[PDB]
Design a protein around this ligand. Sequence first.
Ligand SMILES: [Mg+2]
Ligand SMILES: [Mg+2]
Ligand SMILES: [Mg+2]
Lengths: 250, 251
Amino acid sequence: IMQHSSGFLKLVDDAKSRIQECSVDDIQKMNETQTLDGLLIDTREESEVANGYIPNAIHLSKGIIESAIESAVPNKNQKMYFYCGGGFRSALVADKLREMGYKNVISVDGGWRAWNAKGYPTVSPNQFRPNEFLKLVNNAKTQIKECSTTELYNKINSQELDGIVFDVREDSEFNRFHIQGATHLSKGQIEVKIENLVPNKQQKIYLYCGSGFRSALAAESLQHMGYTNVVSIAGGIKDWLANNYPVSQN
Amino acid sequence: KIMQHSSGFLKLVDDAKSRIQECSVDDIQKMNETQTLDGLLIDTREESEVANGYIPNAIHLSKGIIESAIESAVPNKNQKMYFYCGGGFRSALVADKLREMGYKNVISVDGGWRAWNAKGYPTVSPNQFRPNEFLKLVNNAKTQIKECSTTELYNKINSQELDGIVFDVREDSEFNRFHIQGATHLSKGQIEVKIENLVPNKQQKIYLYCGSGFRSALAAESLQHMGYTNVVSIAGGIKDWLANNYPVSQN
Ligand SMILES: [Mg+2]
Ligand SMILES: [Mg+2]
Ligand SMILES: [Mg+2]
């Protein structure tokens, strides 16, 4: 039960005179039918969104949204739906973004209170899993060969390395540190560059990333190109560091 | 940049292009020029490529990281997204992979950055970027409000001459890291909701600070619209406080 004060609500009433609102029903119907046609933006505090949020939502708090929106959503025509606890703070957000030139903004009347008053589905932050990414990764792992960090490190340390090692992380990740002697070939660029770099498609190639996941996807892709001896390092450089294996910076 | 793409890569690209929708760089340019862009415009190139310039209205999600990031960054599987790369080839692989994950409202920009520049269309450098509308709002607020320096606030606190209530209007995570000793956390998000209960006397002197002086200026302007007549924003924020080697507090 909120006890909103008169001066706050005067600001809210003024904002609501200028911005478009929709119902929680509109959001729920678009969610259920997979027809949501804008960004759905939770403007509540970090401590509020930790207790659950509306499906398909992203977080940009009212406190930071003006300072962040032009970098995060440069397109002034982008359709955006805002909600907060009760439909009042989100009206102020939509009106400020309208003032900045984002006119395709909608505030969700009633907000989180109305959403839960109708019993609509919610999600916890702890519940989030990148399910489709992990499905793609498991799809790749079924098709490829993998090798542990211990097996690779033991080969390197024993001067029995039997393949080329590529770090398929981003520039910034590789630059901070990498497995010593690894060659940087980002997953973004690997299919473009591999045939010029490694024309022998039977050459043994080890790929690693942060976790074993991006490298598995990259290895599947190289197999589609006819590379027959690609190996992904299970657990990636995270598992490598967990085993206290060493890393190097250029 | 003249590219020499290998046959194996282009077979993958041909397979991807057979399953995804493409548009032209003209379509992107026409939507940009008329402010009618109707989806996210996503540059899938490497960090080192985007650092040399990019297409207006674009955001960056490299092909290397996009599958690992998309469900957190764009949870809505119906979100319309346009992808571009150097030449329309990597971006087709990206669009096809996101389609495989259930993001069907995806389009690859045929010809990519190379066709964009071949037609002489406008580009942005990363160093050109300025949050112009945010800075306009801040200057808008500063015109109307009172400000004082970090040194004025510091001297007042250390003289036991503190004449106002001090609010940190940053986010939860920022306040919990460290704050000016004794300041009450009242986020800019919640300040209008809570201020009348915490400060019923609208002539009570109130100091607001944030990281830079920018959010507190916006918050101070909003408090004035509610009839608070003695709000003061700390120019330069807690960054200028630290710049003067003034100490901070946890808990
Ligand atoms: Mg596959
Ligand atoms: Mg104003
Ligand atoms: Mg404290």
